[PDB]
């Protein structure tokens, strides 16, 4: 356990730098796109992604001060539910917006005529509305099931609970296992499998389309595409795989506690996912020449 001190300290500094970078980048992107740039479809997609990331990172200090002493919550019931609702909604919205941006790029590259004749600002806003509705639907179990409970030692741990729902401890355990399994499967499929498949399939088609047409005049587009894909993969696949492994073995973990590496491995993976969320504007918005020109002109 000599090296566990690093495994405990590093997530804190990673979350802190993630908070700083995410707040700075998202504030800059929102200020430039929403006020200093033309209201376009790519502009509103980037603005929605930046708003989701900003609302996620503004919450990050709460998570930092929570996991500083081991996930304890010195705050209260309302603020705890607000924090976790904001985290889950913003994470789902960010991943869904990444998937939607990949789909929009694939549509623009593979079907230029459809993009020219059927990509309008109003329709774009209407179809951005959908991912937010999906995030709300998937955060509904965070809405009702999560609550604040206090251990007899006086420490406050606000997490999911089934005291009211089950009525009897066997029923409580059954419904708790059911909800955890359903939440894990939903996260792995909709939150990870759906966007990762979309990102891999889409961005591969843009790379294939430009390669077939011989439009590659420089290595910049290929480098940007592969950097985005690799960052998203190496930052989300570890966390989602750890969550899936925990959920499939969750019955054993509660009944016998056979697996314990997952408990200490979630934190670095969650830190990596958060750092991906904060770098999303850097690889998604900062890569545009017009955006950087507007940023340097506005300063």
């Amino acid at each position: 356990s000599a090296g566990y001190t690093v495994l405990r300290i590093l997530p804190l500094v990673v979350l802190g730098v993630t908070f700083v970078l995410g707040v700075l980048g998202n504030g800059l992107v929102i200020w430039v796109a929403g006020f200093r740039m033309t209201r376009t479809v790519t502009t509103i997609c980037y603005l929605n992604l930046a708003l989701a990331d900003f609302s996620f990172t503004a919450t990050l200090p709460f998570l930092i001060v929570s996991m500083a002493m081991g996930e304890k919550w010195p705050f209260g019931w309302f603020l705890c539910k607000l924090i976790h609702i904001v985290v889950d909604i913003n994470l789902f919205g960010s991943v869904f917006l990444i998937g939607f941006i990949a789909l929009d790029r694939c549509i623009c590259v593979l079907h230029p005529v459809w993009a020219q004749n059927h990509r309008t600002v109003s329709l774009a806003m209407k179809v951005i509305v959908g991912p937010w509705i999906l995030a709300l639907v998937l955060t509904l179990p965070v809405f009702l099931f999560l609550t604040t409970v206090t251990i007899p030692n006086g420490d406050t741990y606000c997490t999911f609970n089934f005291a009211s729902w089950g009525g009897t401890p066997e029923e409580r355990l059954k419904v708790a296992i059911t909800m955890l399994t359903a939440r894990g499967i939903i996260r792995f499929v909709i939150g990870f499998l759906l966007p990762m498949s979309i990102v891999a399939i889409c961005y591969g088609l843009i790379a294939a389309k430009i390669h077939k047409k011989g439009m590659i005049k420089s290595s910049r587009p290929l480098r940007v595409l592969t950097a985005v894909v690799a960052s998203f993969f190496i930052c989300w696949f570890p966390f989602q795989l750890v969550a899936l492994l925990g959920t499939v073995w969750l019955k054993e973990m509660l009944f016998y506690g056979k697996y314990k590496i997952i408990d200490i491995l979630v934190n670095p993976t969650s830190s990596l996912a958060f750092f991906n969320s904060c770098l999303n504007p850097m690889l998604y918005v900062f890569v545009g020449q017009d955006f950087r020109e507007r940023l340097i002109h506005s300063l």
Binding site: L91, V149, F160, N161, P169
Partner: peptide, 15 residues
């Protein structure tokens, strides 16, 4: 997508 940290400590059924 928010990972539960200490929901395995049987606080899930605590009233």
């Amino acid at each position: 997508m928010a990972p539960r940290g200490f929901s395995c400590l049987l606080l899930l059924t605590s009233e």
